[PDB]
Symmetry: D2
């Protein structure tokens, strides 16, 4: 009779949700409201004081959104959740809540581009300095820490080449120096990786990806201790970012997350097959996938992740032009940014996202002329493999 005691699939379906109390409606009602009516002046005061429970206004909280926040707290084994307008807003609400002028952050370099831009260009303009390191080398993390360091920030697997970061080891290091460890768990979902269980303090997601799963919501979520989440809600979100989630967005995300287990199983079963295919193809120079035993951090990945994920990166023979030929030749895979949708998505950062950026920053950045990123969907993998095989044969 407590959400937290059942099996993980049962939790994915039930945690945070129950039949509507007034009607018995099974689906979580969409509470698409701005405000909430009090029974009396007294009831109203009690709430605002934070001296009693219940709702006030949707920017502060909402019943639909609370369900999503509780569910994801359960799935990550955290105390509390807070939904946001976007994955970016989960990351910024978190870091702007934690940090102030004079503070320092140690961040992985191999992170999502927009996260990198916030940390590189915006944070320092608020007097918050960021040191970037290769987080696959925990010694670089240690060496960059300063007395001012409040936060160590990592993604794993990391967005270009799916390199990994040893969460338990990094956590120990951050904590030794009095810092918090923030892990962006977007690529894996709680079904595949649980950073809190390994020592992380706070997990953030873009729910836009696998947690929603259906390519129709932009949203984020933050999971952590109740004392942190309260500050993130009542200061970060309320005052600083304003990044509240729409109740309709939460409702969809709750709907999408119901099938998280079965989606992740299929995404990962499909991706392993595709990755093996790509590894045997004479036109493919490299394949980056945690499920291939040639992955340089293969055994860490086996300890830390329950499945190897739905994302594959790979380099095609012939560099830029061949990568451009390849992505213009797929008929099933869809050319787009984003990942974790039911559809297979493909992007060639060098001819697409990074064409005006110099060959030199790209390489610094882990991005070679022939690098393709593939988000594996729920189609028949034979169809995806055939589409790839055809596109690759043409391109090379």
């Amino acid at each position: 009779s407590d959400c937290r005691t059942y099996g993980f699939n049962t939790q994915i379906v039930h945690a945070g949700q129950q039949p509507d109390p007034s009607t018995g409606a099974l689906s979580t009602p969409i509470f698409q409201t701005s405000t909430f009516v009090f029974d009396s002046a007294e009831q109203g005061a009690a709430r605002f004081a934070l001296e009693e429970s219940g709702y006030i206004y949707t920017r502060l909280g909402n019943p639909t959104t609370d369900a999503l926040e509780k569910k994801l707290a359960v799935l990550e084994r955290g105390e509390a959740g807070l939904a946001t307008a976007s994955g970016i807003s989960a990351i910024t609400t978190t870091l702007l809540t934690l940090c102030q002028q004079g503070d320092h952050i140690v961040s992985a370099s191999a992170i999502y581009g927009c996260t990198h831009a916030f940390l590189s260009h915006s944070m320092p303009k608020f007097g918050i300095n960021v040191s970037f390191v290769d987080a696959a080398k925990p010694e670089e993390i240690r060496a960059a820490m300063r007395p001012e360091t409040k936060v160590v920030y990592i993604e794993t697997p990391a967005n270009p080449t799916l390199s990994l970061v040893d969460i338990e080891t990094v956590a120990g290091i951050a904590h030794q120096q009095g810092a918090l460890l923030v892990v962006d768990n977007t690529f894996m979902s709680p079904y595949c990786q649980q950073p809190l269980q390994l020592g992380a303090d706070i997990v953030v997601h873009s729910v836009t990806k696998y947690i929603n799963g259906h390519g129709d919501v932009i949203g984020g979520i933050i999971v952590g201790k109740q004392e942190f989440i309260d500050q993130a809600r009542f200061v970060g979100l309320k005052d600083i970012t304003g990044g509240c989630m729409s109740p309709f967005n939460a409702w969809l995300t709750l709907r999408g997350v119901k099938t998280l287990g079965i989606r992740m199983e299929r995404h990962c079963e499909n991706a392993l097959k595709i990755a093996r295919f790509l590894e045997g193809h004479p036109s493919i120079t490299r394949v980056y996938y945690p499920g291939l035993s040639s992955h340089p951090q293969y055994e860490l990945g086996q300890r830390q992740m329950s499945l190897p994920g739905g994302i594959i990166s790979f380099e095609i023979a012939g560099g830029l032009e061949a990568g451009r030929r390849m992505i213009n030749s797929v008929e099933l895979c869809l050319l787009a940014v984003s990942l974790g949708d039911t559809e297979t998505l493909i992007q060639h950062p060098a001819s697409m996202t990074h064409s005006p950026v110099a060959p030199e920053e790209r390489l610094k950045a882990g991005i070679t002329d022939g690098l393709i990123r593939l988000s594996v969907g729920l189609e028949d993998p034979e169809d995806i493999i055939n589409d790839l095989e055809h596109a690759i044969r043409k391109a090379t």
Copy 2:
């Protein structure tokens, strides 16, 4: 054949919208998507470069949200719009885009509470200092400006007692000293006040209030010059706040804004009647409404606003206890925070929102024991007056 040439009611209905190009659908389609598919690698690069038009990903922009942004730009007579997750996020995305460590803001004191909290407690922690003044006295604004001042920030009418700020005069002052003027136009909507036409640089709204009008969306909008709005989108929103609007939220706001003209007319017709009623009631000590000729800035209000608004504040005889008795005695008016809904809403900040705050800060704050705020809805005003009359008679 250009949105901007028609009458204001026609603009409210049509500006920013047209039949769907592929199907002829009259209602703006809800583009409830995360991502967008490119025809080719080439098409994709062109977009990311910002070297061609079209969509990429919903955090950056979306067709439904663009319609709302264009409509509101038209209505405010601004170049460009940007929708946000909330009114707060409109204000913060704006100010965090404009300001960096070492900068200064001159703000009105008589502003929305959560705005006040951001400026008082959060901004300074990013090295951005804020000086608060009585903005009804334009000399206080001038006296507080510093070489570091980037922004002057005002609301008009202002949220407790509906005091006004001379937008044209303040604009002239801010500009003389090289600062921008930001006006929060939430209380009035563009139907009743147009700050850009009076010299303001940027307008922000909580669309949660009268622009949406239906009490079912939390959202914000920012209107200004294209060069500012681009930075607000591609830095502020993309990187810093993450405060993007859901396409469903935009769709509803577009739907709600269709009736803006007719709603504002009725809200204001209703409020004037209620305000006159309250002014003749021997149990009511004061009535704050711009449409009453005893308003201390009555003639400014006549120059600057086309209608006197839908919000009334008033003090009931007997202070705190009588205000508490009064709001517990209404049967039609609903006790809640927020404003600009089709329903009449009432709040007694001293027994509700501000009961744990000391009698002394409250007065500083413009908030007396008997102060009630009333958001006039679209009901029959005789019904609202009778509900008030009954509640007041009981309370006193």
Copy 3:
């Protein structure tokens, strides 16, 4: 404290709705669910028996939809409401619930086309015969009644030329002969006409038109005595048509109906102005509008309707080709079927809806070569008049 006692505007806003009981949410929650969970086997039996209140399954009923049904019952001064998938489904659920093989219906001829097709071609194939008459001549109604007659069916105003039907007189006639009177009140809404108050037994609407008002819902509603509505729900809808409304559709319709009063006022103020304009134009041969004193049933219209409506029909000089030229020349008015949207809509049945139909059936049907139907929106009427003036000048 009873919905039914307040003023009509107050009823439009509040009737059928209240704050959510479990949370205080002001907006009616969207109960977008299929089923409802019982506390026990006992609770479940009680409900199915129809021996206790509460929900079972959304085809039978739903909390969101119930709010809409109660509101519209209040507005029409009927006992009970039942929402449907469409206006057609309101009409068919009603008539298929009432009638069986061997029964007879007396219908107006001047009715909506799809209604006409159901009565002309489908009803008789179920052994239910229909006699069509000119319902503007109550003697034709009397003369067509038979011992088998269960129902007299009318629209007023009627869809081509806005001819009227004397509801009170027809009701008296139908009742004298033991039949029920069904009135389709779509064109007027309850704000402008109340057929139950004049003696009708059952009212039906396409809520797609003015009750929703926003051009984004297909739906219907039926209002009548509880004993009829129960049969319409538990037989007609449950078993025969299956025509249940989506809870999201109901939610939108509830949202749209909030502004019914202010929309109808503006639609009718706009239409009267446009109609006067069209009556003075030398290129316009006829104008059909109840608000023009030359309307042949002008004084009936003054007794029966509170406003003259938002729909205008008119004939342009030069017949078919000029009507085609005219509708291809409007730049603001939108060419489409449907009516009662915030946008101005125009249709030229002879070149559009009825081009393959012979000049001869069209005339029978009330439809002349130059007949244009105009649904007046909420734009500035000067803009609509200018668009019309321009299009008419060009066409003639």
Copy 4:
């Protein structure tokens, strides 16, 4: 590049859908509109004539709904689809389109209750007679056919005890006598059974169940030859039932159906495990599940179905009272009607749905005092088994 050529999982994801043509939006836009605007009078006529393609009005058709209709046509290997307001409306729109006064239907007895009520009580009142038979005995079907017989109507598996009907054999029989075969495929979905491939003429579903899968849509779909579907759309739906689907409902159903393959796999894997558990339990007298080899039509089920389904019926020792004790004792399984949701649902028709019905009709009806129906969800099956084990132990 044709939907129909890919693997079944690929079809579930992609069939009927493509990126939005005007924007590239990946998610099918929600075209939540009533009407559609024409470019000219000419364009409008062309469409109405049925002499050109494109949209007119949402009751007739809509882009979102069309996607769903095309997808499901692909999945069932039929020519065309038509979405409806409910499963009931799919069945009635179909049969009322096909049949007229004097016609005859041969129906299975073991069908959904509301279907039974339509055929038993409503059809005959339109002069359409229905003969009910045990459809597990194809000779009873043959013996009941009459020269007037237009339709043979079956469900398989059938709603109480999951008895089967030999679709290929029944099809051959119906066709021999000049009748059409209609199969309600709701229990299986196209992932598990394809009646058209076995000779059925028309398939109907309640999409409320497994096709949507998420317990938040009431809807139906009809699949068949284009010439039948056109009549079902342009007469049945347009004129008779009015049972059109909301575009939002279609959008959700499209969203839900993306995971159909992976959901059905898990539902059926879970159900087989639960069914084996129930078969070994000394307190359970019978277990009705097609996947148990003791099922009396086990081998037919192996030929006709790809998986044995997600529904299990079973009788508990001690009849009525024990069944009532059992369902009041489950803590995880939810007491509700409906099936095919992500949640496990349970119903005890004798103490719930059929408590006021005499012990005698119930038995006629296949319904014993101890009969429980279980809709297996996506939870961990060990959790469901433990909940059952606990509830059963308590009840007996």
